[PDB]
Amino acid sequence: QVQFKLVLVGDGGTGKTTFVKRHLTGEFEKKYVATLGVEVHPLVFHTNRGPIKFNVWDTAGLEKFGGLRDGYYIQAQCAIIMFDVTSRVTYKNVPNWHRDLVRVCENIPIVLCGNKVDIKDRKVKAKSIVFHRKKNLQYYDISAKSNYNFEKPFLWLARKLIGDPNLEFVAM
Amino acid sequence: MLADHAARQLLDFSQKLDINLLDNVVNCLYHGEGAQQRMAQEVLTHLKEHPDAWTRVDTILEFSQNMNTKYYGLQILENVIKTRWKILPRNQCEGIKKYVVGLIIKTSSDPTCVEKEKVYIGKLNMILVQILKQEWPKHWPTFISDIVGASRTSESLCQNNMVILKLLSEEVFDFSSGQITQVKSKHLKDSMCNEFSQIFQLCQFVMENSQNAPLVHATLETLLRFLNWIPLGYIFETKLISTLIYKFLNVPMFRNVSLKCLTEIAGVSVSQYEEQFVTLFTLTMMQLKQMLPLNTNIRLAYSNGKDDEQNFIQNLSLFLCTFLKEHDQLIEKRLNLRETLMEALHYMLLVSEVEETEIFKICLEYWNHLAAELYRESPFSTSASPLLSGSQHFDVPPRRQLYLPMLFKVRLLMVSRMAKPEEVLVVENDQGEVVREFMKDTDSINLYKNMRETLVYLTHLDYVDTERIMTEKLHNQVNGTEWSWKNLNTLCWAIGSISGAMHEEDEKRFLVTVIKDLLGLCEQKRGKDNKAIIASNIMYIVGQYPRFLRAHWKFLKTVVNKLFEFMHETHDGVQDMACDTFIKIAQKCRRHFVQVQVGEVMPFIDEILNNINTIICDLQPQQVHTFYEAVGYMIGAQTDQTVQEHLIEKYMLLPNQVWDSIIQQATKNVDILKDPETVKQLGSILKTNVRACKAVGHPFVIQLGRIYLDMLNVYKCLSENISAAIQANGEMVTKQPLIRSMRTVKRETLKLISGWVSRSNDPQMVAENFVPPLLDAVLIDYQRNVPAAREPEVLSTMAIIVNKLGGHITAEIPQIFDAVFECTLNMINKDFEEYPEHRTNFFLLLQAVNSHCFPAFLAIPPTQFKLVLDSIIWAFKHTMRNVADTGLQILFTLLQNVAQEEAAAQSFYQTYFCDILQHIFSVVTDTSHTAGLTMHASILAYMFNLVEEGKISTSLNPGNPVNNQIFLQEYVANLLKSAFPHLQDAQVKLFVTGLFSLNQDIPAFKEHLRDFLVQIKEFAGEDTSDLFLEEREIALRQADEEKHKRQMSV
Amino acid sequence: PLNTNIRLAYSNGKDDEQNFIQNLSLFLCTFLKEHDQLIEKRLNLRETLMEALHYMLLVSEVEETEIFKICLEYWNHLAAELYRESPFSTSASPLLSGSQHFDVPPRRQLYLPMLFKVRLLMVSRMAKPEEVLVVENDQGEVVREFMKDTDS
Amino acid sequence: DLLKAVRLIKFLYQSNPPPNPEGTRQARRNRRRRWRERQRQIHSISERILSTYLGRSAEPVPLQTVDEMTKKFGTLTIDC
């Protein structure tokens, strides 16, 4: 029922599993249980135009646990590439994830999410976050701990997918 | 629909695999859920890891019917090619290469498969790219010419060949780092450059002659990727720019890719093609105006446009930004192009109105570049030369007039689309408290800062026009023509943004006029909502202009009185606004609050103190804390120690009263500590105390000493109370509000300790009077506490103290560790995930101790020191990147400290050096720690350097007085061979030699380590041709010569 | 609604709408001319007064000469009623003396949010200063005649 | 060093509280002409103070009636 295939990718130990758990339960995970391959989680929202479902494929961010790797990306309907703003490397690795993703889904709405902006000492200053511009990715600052822009990525993705720019998430 | 044993049955490689069974497995993976999908994932991952799986891959492709299963087989093939291509039999390599080439050709022959199996075709193209990277140009140098001929034979074949060329270029240039050795990448780049001419000729032929729009688009994409690195001669010395602008820029199906290529070209900053750039611009604009009339509402087009149109508009903005930033000086000197220049700027205005943050960001970037150049030119005259009404015009440097017709529209855009200066969220902490957090350095805050800088520069250029613009929009609000809360808020934000950009008198007059108009508006409007909006805006504006307030005492007094009047308001947001403005005004005018103001015989602070209770009757605890912070700022401005003491005493009188009452009650009975209301009162009191300490600081000591001892007891009285409850119900009780408030009070106590300590300035007194009580009250309690009850903030808190106290705390360090160390280590030494806060704070404490209490390490038993080292090794083996970096920094600082201690250096080396090498190399060889690479080499180069510089006087093998260098070389070679037997000995020998040669070129050392890691991923056969061993050896000998030249020069 | 484009409505509206807009301009002009002194001194009506002004501005944009004539009549009556007691106060509005500029009569203060708007409207829709015609006299001579005291 | 000259100019602007415009249109003509002479004097003082040390920047202001003339000439329509 109006569900889409969403692929969450990014460097391991950045928050992908954290973000997915925060959206599913509402609690904020503290520990980093390194993901193995991919976990599929349904996630429901109530927009002004009814229910919506994201099939979040929270994929492992560590190569040693890459498993099927890009194989997971097949049939993906939307993509969230996510990094950590406190670790420059997790950003510089972003283009690799982007290339791998695009190689399977040429034309799919893509959101670059900077997780855990809450931490005081930000490393990847917004001034240097530019990769999205040329590639036409939609950027978003988020923080799974402070809940900042929690639904912004999903709201933007739903607007892109459905085609309703004025579509709005409702509480129930 | 399958049992794990049934799935593993496929792992019997002596039997034919059921292709239908694999199709079922993959369909279950992509449509099954939970245990079924997890099982399928696990089984397929295991199979892909199998060595001989490739033996079936060929049979799979001929029989496979599911493109997904074909993709999995191709993944297996990619692993094989990326691992063992130098070990696979040559005959089988060539056979499978022919197989894949034929399959690609057959697929390209069917257009339906081309549309249907695009992902499969792309995977095939990437597999071939890897194959060629292993082979090309050595074993297939004739490939490129043949394929271009083949390209000439068929349009679809040409399309696929350009796609494969694009992938090759991406892999060679854009994504080579981290996957390919430096020398192999250099060789591939050289070969590509050498053969590029054929590709360029082919693409130009296709562009001029091809009509297959998909083929043209693929050609444009491949050219786009080539544009990253190809020599400029191929770009600007052909019909390329004109061809793109005339054939494709006007075509919607190609405009996006063409304009992307044009933007990349625009980014080239070289004079050798000046005129070309101009032509590129001149024609481009000519085309743009045909496609996109300057009278079109770009905002409406975007909001009503599709994905392609919006992407095109974004690309247009990017192209204009890049080209103008790089060629403004070029376009300025040509008068005949002046009109066209304006058109470009015109577009940006129309672009700047689009309702997308990123487009406005690009526009702001360009506008700020313009404003920076103009404010580097103008102030020489305007700032360092006085001006009069309209005198700016006469002194105008020539370059400004060029853009002058657009400065006022830029100002209007800024004042119309200014973003919120500060973002605040309501966040639920772990303690269940919803609090207001002020975001910092977020994207939006950077946006506001850039807008503020641009507008401030423009104000410096022409402040009168800006002032007229705010005044005009303010009137538009007063007359109600442009009435809306958003517009007023934006205007007021803009007005505040430019504080200090104007001369004192002009800013004074502008503020007076603005405030008078605002108060008139407030009198005009009906409805509490709008009146509160206006009042909040006025308060924010005045807060943003503290200079005027400092110059006018009476207005300040009136403002603060009105703020206190507001504080009693119940309507939403009024109180929070008033508190925020109050703290801002306090921060910016403390001197005026405590300095006796003319017309007043006592500082206003006295009345504030007397009327606190009246002021706070209608305030929330958070607002109370914020107000107390404000007062603390004012108090800290005081200089007289005794007057400050009395002011603080009167200041904390009410929290002190409640605290003393509760202390007496606890003395009567301790069960009251379980009173939820009492615990919440403690939380509020302690939040007030921490805010006051933060605002006031070291003088707060007099306040702290008032309760310190008692408060410590409370902590103990609190801590024990928790443990039993946990023992009663485990961690579940922690979810109860009571336990949460207990932990909240604990955390606030620790936060107060840290807050005061950080800003202290009498370390002797701090250590003598304040630490021993903490030793007994908490540390002994902390060890006595059960693990789950132990509060991680304790650990880090202690670090802060030593971070400030250094040597003064050294004598007390041992007792601390014997109290906390093993119980902490025994709590984290089993895995890497539980108690992350404890891990991080513990390593923070270790880092502080190492940084500032090294002699404590000098004074501990060797067993404790070895435990510390094992803990560190556990640390930088962590996956938590923060933990890893902290551990590595600790290790580096420890090595430097050892170097500072001559006596124990040799002993420490002999004891730990080889184990340290083993551990560091085990981590480095692990890909999961690549993020720490920069630090790894930093220490390695140092460590190896220590060996080379003879600073390790003793032989690391006392039984053999060999050169430490030679022994280390052999030891590392043996270690690596043991870990990686399949490697070629020459590889390891060269790698070690470089490690010694590269101990002073840190980036080169890092690239050397990356090359070694890439090598580790490959099963390297005796074929060293692809390894370019002699080339890297020559480069390494050159680097060693450079290093020895640096040494002689030093 | 005050946010509608009156000019577009008139261009696309039917006879009834155009007549209604003309009558609205008529009523506003007459009532304001005769009772600005009354409405000015009552603060609670100020906002409402400004709305009226807003209307006339949008009305002045109509692509009809008669409607613009009515609006111009109203604005000219405003300007005349704005009898510059001390135009040197205007000259004081710049960096010259302030207090004299702050002696600005109350009505000028009340209309300040609109004086510049009227200025812009005038500048945007100023009519041709001189009209010249190609006249063929009875003798067949083609001459240029400067019309005088016409409506334009 | 420079702010003081600016404050001086702003004062000299503020030190002339025009005249009071009363009387018949000819007495008011005479007041207009007197205030105009006062403005002339103010501008002369400002320009001379500029010549003191700022002149190096604002000297061309009177001379712009020759550069504007070189711009009024050269209106050549050599092409379309």
mmCIF file with all atom_site columns, C-alpha atoms in Angstrom, chain A residues 5 22 27 30-34 36-40 57 62-75 87 89-90 93 95-96 98-100 102-106 117-120 122 125-130 132-141 143 145-149 152 156 160 165, chain B residues 29-30 32-34 37-38 41 44-45 48-49 68 71-72 75 78 118-119 122-123 126 167 170-171 175 179 225 260 263-264 302-303 307 310-311 314-315 318 356 358 361-362 365 423 425-428 430 437 439-444 446 747 832-837 879-881 926-928 930-931:
data_model
loop_
_atom_site.group_PDB
_atom_site.id
_atom_site.type_symbol
_atom_site.label_atom_id
_atom_site.label_alt_id
_atom_site.label_comp_id
_atom_site.label_asym_id
_atom_site.label_entity_id
_atom_site.label_seq_id
_atom_site.pdbx_PDB_ins_code
_atom_site.Cartn_x
_atom_site.Cartn_y
_atom_site.Cartn_z
_atom_site.occupancy
_atom_site.B_iso_or_equiv
_atom_site.pdbx_formal_charge
_atom_site.auth_seq_id
_atom_site.auth_comp_id
_atom_site.auth_asym_id
_atom_site.auth_atom_id
_atom_site.pdbx_PDB_model_num
ATOM 1   C CA . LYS A 1 5   ? 11.902 0.969   -1.779  1.00 0.00 ? 5   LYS A CA 1
ATOM 2   C CA . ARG A 1 22  ? 14.926 6.449   15.956  1.00 0.00 ? 22  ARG A CA 1
ATOM 3   C CA . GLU A 1 27  ? 14.118 5.909   21.176  1.00 0.00 ? 27  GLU A CA 1
ATOM 4   C CA . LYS A 1 30  ? 23.564 4.969   22.030  1.00 0.00 ? 30  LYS A CA 1
ATOM 5   C CA . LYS A 1 31  ? 25.684 1.935   21.121  1.00 0.00 ? 31  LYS A CA 1
ATOM 6   C CA . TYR A 1 32  ? 27.023 1.133   17.651  1.00 0.00 ? 32  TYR A CA 1
ATOM 7   C CA . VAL A 1 33  ? 26.080 -2.433  16.744  1.00 0.00 ? 33  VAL A CA 1
ATOM 8   C CA . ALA A 1 34  ? 27.894 -2.535  13.409  1.00 0.00 ? 34  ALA A CA 1
ATOM 9   C CA . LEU A 1 36  ? 25.785 -6.689  8.698   1.00 0.00 ? 36  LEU A CA 1
ATOM 10  C CA . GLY A 1 37  ? 24.786 -6.322  5.066   1.00 0.00 ? 37  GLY A CA 1
ATOM 11  C CA . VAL A 1 38  ? 21.303 -4.798  5.152   1.00 0.00 ? 38  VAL A CA 1
ATOM 12  C CA . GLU A 1 39  ? 18.274 -4.784  7.433   1.00 0.00 ? 39  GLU A CA 1
ATOM 13  C CA . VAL A 1 40  ? 14.877 -4.025  5.894   1.00 0.00 ? 40  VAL A CA 1
ATOM 14  C CA . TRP A 1 57  ? 17.166 -0.880  3.501   1.00 0.00 ? 57  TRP A CA 1
ATOM 15  C CA . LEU A 1 62  ? 31.628 -1.349  6.730   1.00 0.00 ? 62  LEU A CA 1
ATOM 16  C CA . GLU A 1 63  ? 33.188 -3.024  3.706   1.00 0.00 ? 63  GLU A CA 1
ATOM 17  C CA . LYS A 1 64  ? 34.126 -6.144  5.665   1.00 0.00 ? 64  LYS A CA 1
ATOM 18  C CA . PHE A 1 65  ? 30.371 -6.537  6.205   1.00 0.00 ? 65  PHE A CA 1
ATOM 19  C CA . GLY A 1 66  ? 29.523 -5.271  2.722   1.00 0.00 ? 66  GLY A CA 1
ATOM 20  C CA . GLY A 1 67  ? 27.967 -8.576  1.737   1.00 0.00 ? 67  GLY A CA 1
ATOM 21  C CA . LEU A 1 68  ? 25.857 -8.142  -1.372  1.00 0.00 ? 68  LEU A CA 1
ATOM 22  C CA . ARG A 1 69  ? 26.846 -4.455  -1.321  1.00 0.00 ? 69  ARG A CA 1
ATOM 23  C CA . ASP A 1 70  ? 25.482 -2.708  -4.403  1.00 0.00 ? 70  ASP A CA 1
ATOM 24  C CA . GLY A 1 71  ? 23.284 -5.740  -5.015  1.00 0.00 ? 71  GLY A CA 1
ATOM 25  C CA . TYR A 1 72  ? 20.924 -4.364  -2.387  1.00 0.00 ? 72  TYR A CA 1
ATOM 26  C CA . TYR A 1 73  ? 20.452 -1.226  -4.492  1.00 0.00 ? 73  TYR A CA 1
ATOM 27  C CA . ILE A 1 74  ? 18.529 -3.086  -7.209  1.00 0.00 ? 74  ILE A CA 1
ATOM 28  C CA . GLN A 1 75  ? 14.957 -1.851  -7.695  1.00 0.00 ? 75  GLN A CA 1
ATOM 29  C CA . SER A 1 87  ? 34.572 13.002  10.531  1.00 0.00 ? 87  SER A CA 1
ATOM 30  C CA . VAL A 1 89  ? 36.630 11.017  5.842   1.00 0.00 ? 89  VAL A CA 1
ATOM 31  C CA . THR A 1 90  ? 33.000 9.943   6.137   1.00 0.00 ? 90  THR A CA 1
ATOM 32  C CA . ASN A 1 93  ? 33.820 8.808   0.997   1.00 0.00 ? 93  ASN A CA 1
ATOM 33  C CA . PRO A 1 95  ? 31.239 10.415  -3.753  1.00 0.00 ? 95  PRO A CA 1
ATOM 34  C CA . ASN A 1 96  ? 32.047 6.695   -3.752  1.00 0.00 ? 96  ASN A CA 1
ATOM 35  C CA . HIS A 1 98  ? 27.015 8.302   -4.816  1.00 0.00 ? 98  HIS A CA 1
ATOM 36  C CA . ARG A 1 99  ? 28.734 6.700   -7.802  1.00 0.00 ? 99  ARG A CA 1
ATOM 37  C CA . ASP A 1 100 ? 27.854 3.184   -6.667  1.00 0.00 ? 100 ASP A CA 1
ATOM 38  C CA . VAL A 1 102 ? 23.823 6.074   -9.407  1.00 0.00 ? 102 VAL A CA 1
ATOM 39  C CA . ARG A 1 103 ? 25.366 3.166   -11.297 1.00 0.00 ? 103 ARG A CA 1
ATOM 40  C CA . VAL A 1 104 ? 22.225 1.154   -10.471 1.00 0.00 ? 104 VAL A CA 1
ATOM 41  C CA . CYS A 1 105 ? 19.548 3.874   -10.179 1.00 0.00 ? 105 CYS A CA 1
ATOM 42  C CA . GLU A 1 106 ? 20.389 6.537   -12.754 1.00 0.00 ? 106 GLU A CA 1
ATOM 43  C CA . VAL A 1 117 ? 24.864 17.774  13.704  1.00 0.00 ? 117 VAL A CA 1
ATOM 44  C CA . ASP A 1 118 ? 24.084 18.156  17.415  1.00 0.00 ? 118 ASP A CA 1
ATOM 45  C CA . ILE A 1 119 ? 27.649 17.371  18.499  1.00 0.00 ? 119 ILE A CA 1
ATOM 46  C CA . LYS A 1 120 ? 29.333 20.660  19.304  1.00 0.00 ? 120 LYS A CA 1
ATOM 47  C CA . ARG A 1 122 ? 31.391 20.012  13.726  1.00 0.00 ? 122 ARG A CA 1
ATOM 48  C CA . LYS A 1 125 ? 31.430 22.850  7.859   1.00 0.00 ? 125 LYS A CA 1
ATOM 49  C CA . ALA A 1 126 ? 28.381 23.624  5.748   1.00 0.00 ? 126 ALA A CA 1
ATOM 50  C CA . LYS A 1 127 ? 30.662 25.929  3.760   1.00 0.00 ? 127 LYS A CA 1
ATOM 51  C CA . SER A 1 128 ? 32.457 22.842  2.435   1.00 0.00 ? 128 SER A CA 1
ATOM 52  C CA . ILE A 1 129 ? 29.343 20.694  1.881   1.00 0.00 ? 129 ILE A CA 1
ATOM 53  C CA . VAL A 1 130 ? 29.007 21.282  -1.863  1.00 0.00 ? 130 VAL A CA 1
ATOM 54  C CA . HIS A 1 132 ? 25.183 17.875  -3.774  1.00 0.00 ? 132 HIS A CA 1
ATOM 55  C CA . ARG A 1 133 ? 25.102 21.061  -5.864  1.00 0.00 ? 133 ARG A CA 1
ATOM 56  C CA . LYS A 1 134 ? 26.695 19.675  -9.022  1.00 0.00 ? 134 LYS A CA 1
ATOM 57  C CA . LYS A 1 135 ? 24.956 16.299  -8.725  1.00 0.00 ? 135 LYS A CA 1
ATOM 58  C CA . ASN A 1 136 ? 21.533 17.830  -7.944  1.00 0.00 ? 136 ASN A CA 1
ATOM 59  C CA . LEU A 1 137 ? 21.257 15.965  -4.642  1.00 0.00 ? 137 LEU A CA 1
ATOM 60  C CA . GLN A 1 138 ? 19.018 17.483  -1.985  1.00 0.00 ? 138 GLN A CA 1
ATOM 61  C CA . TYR A 1 139 ? 21.033 18.226  1.136   1.00 0.00 ? 139 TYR A CA 1
ATOM 62  C CA . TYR A 1 140 ? 19.819 18.145  4.731   1.00 0.00 ? 140 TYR A CA 1
ATOM 63  C CA . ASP A 1 141 ? 21.351 18.713  8.155   1.00 0.00 ? 141 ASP A CA 1
ATOM 64  C CA . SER A 1 143 ? 20.812 14.853  14.122  1.00 0.00 ? 143 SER A CA 1
ATOM 65  C CA . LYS A 1 145 ? 20.043 12.527  18.900  1.00 0.00 ? 145 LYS A CA 1
ATOM 66  C CA . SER A 1 146 ? 18.540 16.028  19.004  1.00 0.00 ? 146 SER A CA 1
ATOM 67  C CA . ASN A 1 147 ? 15.798 15.032  16.521  1.00 0.00 ? 147 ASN A CA 1
ATOM 68  C CA . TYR A 1 148 ? 16.677 18.007  14.294  1.00 0.00 ? 148 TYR A CA 1
ATOM 69  C CA . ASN A 1 149 ? 15.151 17.845  10.806  1.00 0.00 ? 149 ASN A CA 1
ATOM 70  C CA . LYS A 1 152 ? 12.914 16.479  6.566   1.00 0.00 ? 152 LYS A CA 1
ATOM 71  C CA . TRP A 1 156 ? 11.394 15.639  0.787   1.00 0.00 ? 156 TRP A CA 1
ATOM 72  C CA . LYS A 1 160 ? 9.643  13.952  -4.901  1.00 0.00 ? 160 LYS A CA 1
ATOM 73  C CA . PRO A 1 165 ? 5.254  19.502  -3.753  1.00 0.00 ? 165 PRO A CA 1
ATOM 74  C CA . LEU B 2 29  ? 15.442 -11.834 -0.598  1.00 0.00 ? 29  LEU B CA 1
ATOM 75  C CA . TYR B 2 30  ? 13.838 -8.973  -2.528  1.00 0.00 ? 30  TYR B CA 1
ATOM 76  C CA . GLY B 2 32  ? 10.628 -11.854 1.770   1.00 0.00 ? 32  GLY B CA 1
ATOM 77  C CA . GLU B 2 33  ? 10.877 -10.430 5.260   1.00 0.00 ? 33  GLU B CA 1
ATOM 78  C CA . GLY B 2 34  ? 12.465 -11.191 8.597   1.00 0.00 ? 34  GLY B CA 1
ATOM 79  C CA . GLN B 2 37  ? 15.241 -12.562 3.998   1.00 0.00 ? 37  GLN B CA 1
ATOM 80  C CA . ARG B 2 38  ? 17.977 -12.621 6.646   1.00 0.00 ? 38  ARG B CA 1
ATOM 81  C CA . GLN B 2 41  ? 21.212 -12.633 2.738   1.00 0.00 ? 41  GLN B CA 1
ATOM 82  C CA . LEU B 2 44  ? 24.275 -15.503 -0.531  1.00 0.00 ? 44  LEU B CA 1
ATOM 83  C CA . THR B 2 45  ? 26.996 -13.591 1.319   1.00 0.00 ? 45  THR B CA 1
ATOM 84  C CA . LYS B 2 48  ? 29.894 -14.962 -2.706  1.00 0.00 ? 48  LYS B CA 1
ATOM 85  C CA . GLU B 2 49  ? 32.797 -15.407 -0.274  1.00 0.00 ? 49  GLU B CA 1
ATOM 86  C CA . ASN B 2 68  ? 19.120 -10.169 -10.283 1.00 0.00 ? 68  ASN B CA 1
ATOM 87  C CA . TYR B 2 71  ? 23.875 -9.492  -11.074 1.00 0.00 ? 71  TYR B CA 1
ATOM 88  C CA . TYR B 2 72  ? 24.876 -11.644 -8.105  1.00 0.00 ? 72  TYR B CA 1
ATOM 89  C CA . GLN B 2 75  ? 29.356 -9.596  -8.251  1.00 0.00 ? 75  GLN B CA 1
ATOM 90  C CA . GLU B 2 78  ? 33.969 -8.870  -9.807  1.00 0.00 ? 78  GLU B CA 1
ATOM 91  C CA . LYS B 2 118 ? 20.317 -1.261  -18.028 1.00 0.00 ? 118 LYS B CA 1
ATOM 92  C CA . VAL B 2 119 ? 21.612 -2.145  -14.558 1.00 0.00 ? 119 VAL B CA 1
ATOM 93  C CA . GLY B 2 122 ? 26.215 -1.286  -16.433 1.00 0.00 ? 122 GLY B CA 1
ATOM 94  C CA . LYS B 2 123 ? 27.458 -4.061  -14.169 1.00 0.00 ? 123 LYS B CA 1
ATOM 95  C CA . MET B 2 126 ? 32.152 -2.161  -14.769 1.00 0.00 ? 126 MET B CA 1
ATOM 96  C CA . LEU B 2 167 ? 33.256 4.301   -16.548 1.00 0.00 ? 167 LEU B CA 1
ATOM 97  C CA . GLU B 2 170 ? 35.713 7.657   -13.680 1.00 0.00 ? 170 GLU B CA 1
ATOM 98  C CA . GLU B 2 171 ? 37.607 4.677   -12.274 1.00 0.00 ? 171 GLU B CA 1
ATOM 99  C CA . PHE B 2 175 ? 37.659 7.108   -7.999  1.00 0.00 ? 175 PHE B CA 1
ATOM 100 C CA . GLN B 2 179 ? 41.367 1.359   -4.958  1.00 0.00 ? 179 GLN B CA 1
ATOM 101 C CA . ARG B 2 225 ? 33.421 12.834  -17.385 1.00 0.00 ? 225 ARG B CA 1
ATOM 102 C CA . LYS B 2 260 ? 27.058 20.773  -16.855 1.00 0.00 ? 260 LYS B CA 1
ATOM 103 C CA . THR B 2 263 ? 30.115 24.790  -16.061 1.00 0.00 ? 263 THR B CA 1
ATOM 104 C CA . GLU B 2 264 ? 33.082 22.441  -15.729 1.00 0.00 ? 264 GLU B CA 1
ATOM 105 C CA . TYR B 2 302 ? 10.469 26.238  -10.754 1.00 0.00 ? 302 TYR B CA 1
ATOM 106 C CA . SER B 2 303 ? 7.531  25.804  -8.381  1.00 0.00 ? 303 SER B CA 1
ATOM 107 C CA . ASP B 2 307 ? 12.484 17.675  -12.295 1.00 0.00 ? 307 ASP B CA 1
ATOM 108 C CA . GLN B 2 310 ? 14.391 22.587  -11.913 1.00 0.00 ? 310 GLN B CA 1
ATOM 109 C CA . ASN B 2 311 ? 17.670 20.752  -12.492 1.00 0.00 ? 311 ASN B CA 1
ATOM 110 C CA . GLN B 2 314 ? 20.069 24.872  -10.812 1.00 0.00 ? 314 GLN B CA 1
ATOM 111 C CA . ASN B 2 315 ? 22.670 24.095  -13.481 1.00 0.00 ? 315 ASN B CA 1
ATOM 112 C CA . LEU B 2 318 ? 25.897 27.039  -11.057 1.00 0.00 ? 318 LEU B CA 1
ATOM 113 C CA . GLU B 2 356 ? 14.853 26.305  -2.895  1.00 0.00 ? 356 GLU B CA 1
ATOM 114 C CA . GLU B 2 358 ? 20.353 25.365  -2.475  1.00 0.00 ? 358 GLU B CA 1
ATOM 115 C CA . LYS B 2 361 ? 22.861 29.302  -1.519  1.00 0.00 ? 361 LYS B CA 1
ATOM 116 C CA . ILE B 2 362 ? 24.581 29.324  -4.910  1.00 0.00 ? 362 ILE B CA 1
ATOM 117 C CA . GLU B 2 365 ? 27.903 32.476  -2.825  1.00 0.00 ? 365 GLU B CA 1
ATOM 118 C CA . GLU B 2 423 ? 17.592 27.970  15.171  1.00 0.00 ? 423 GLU B CA 1
ATOM 119 C CA . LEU B 2 425 ? 14.792 23.107  19.023  1.00 0.00 ? 425 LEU B CA 1
ATOM 120 C CA . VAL B 2 426 ? 12.767 21.573  21.831  1.00 0.00 ? 426 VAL B CA 1
ATOM 121 C CA . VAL B 2 427 ? 14.746 18.409  22.591  1.00 0.00 ? 427 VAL B CA 1
ATOM 122 C CA . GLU B 2 428 ? 13.904 15.634  25.058  1.00 0.00 ? 428 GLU B CA 1
ATOM 123 C CA . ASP B 2 430 ? 17.581 11.209  28.323  1.00 0.00 ? 430 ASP B CA 1
ATOM 124 C CA . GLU B 2 437 ? 18.722 23.989  22.596  1.00 0.00 ? 437 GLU B CA 1
ATOM 125 C CA . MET B 2 439 ? 21.749 25.064  17.328  1.00 0.00 ? 439 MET B CA 1
ATOM 126 C CA . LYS B 2 440 ? 25.267 26.060  16.317  1.00 0.00 ? 440 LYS B CA 1
ATOM 127 C CA . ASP B 2 441 ? 27.082 26.029  12.970  1.00 0.00 ? 441 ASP B CA 1
ATOM 128 C CA . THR B 2 442 ? 24.114 24.414  11.253  1.00 0.00 ? 442 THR B CA 1
ATOM 129 C CA . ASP B 2 443 ? 23.610 24.884  7.532   1.00 0.00 ? 443 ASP B CA 1
ATOM 130 C CA . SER B 2 444 ? 21.023 27.604  8.140   1.00 0.00 ? 444 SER B CA 1
ATOM 131 C CA . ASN B 2 446 ? 26.029 29.475  7.853   1.00 0.00 ? 446 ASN B CA 1
ATOM 132 C CA . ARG B 2 747 ? 24.528 14.935  36.394  1.00 0.00 ? 747 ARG B CA 1
ATOM 133 C CA . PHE B 2 832 ? 33.388 -2.560  21.981  1.00 0.00 ? 832 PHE B CA 1
ATOM 134 C CA . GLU B 2 833 ? 29.708 -1.547  22.151  1.00 0.00 ? 833 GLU B CA 1
ATOM 135 C CA . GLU B 2 834 ? 28.407 -1.595  25.726  1.00 0.00 ? 834 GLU B CA 1
ATOM 136 C CA . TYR B 2 835 ? 28.624 1.573   27.822  1.00 0.00 ? 835 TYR B CA 1
ATOM 137 C CA . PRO B 2 836 ? 29.900 3.838   25.020  1.00 0.00 ? 836 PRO B CA 1
ATOM 138 C CA . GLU B 2 837 ? 29.702 6.910   27.251  1.00 0.00 ? 837 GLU B CA 1
ATOM 139 C CA . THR B 2 879 ? 35.303 0.982   15.751  1.00 0.00 ? 879 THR B CA 1
ATOM 140 C CA . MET B 2 880 ? 33.980 4.130   17.457  1.00 0.00 ? 880 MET B CA 1
ATOM 141 C CA . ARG B 2 881 ? 35.892 6.744   15.487  1.00 0.00 ? 881 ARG B CA 1
ATOM 142 C CA . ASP B 2 926 ? 42.032 -3.532  8.899   1.00 0.00 ? 926 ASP B CA 1
ATOM 143 C CA . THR B 2 927 ? 39.992 -1.387  6.529   1.00 0.00 ? 927 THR B CA 1
ATOM 144 C CA . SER B 2 928 ? 37.556 -0.415  9.285   1.00 0.00 ? 928 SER B CA 1
ATOM 145 C CA . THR B 2 930 ? 40.886 3.875   7.437   1.00 0.00 ? 930 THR B CA 1
ATOM 146 C CA . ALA B 2 931 ? 39.500 7.043   9.023   1.00 0.00 ? 931 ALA B CA 1
#
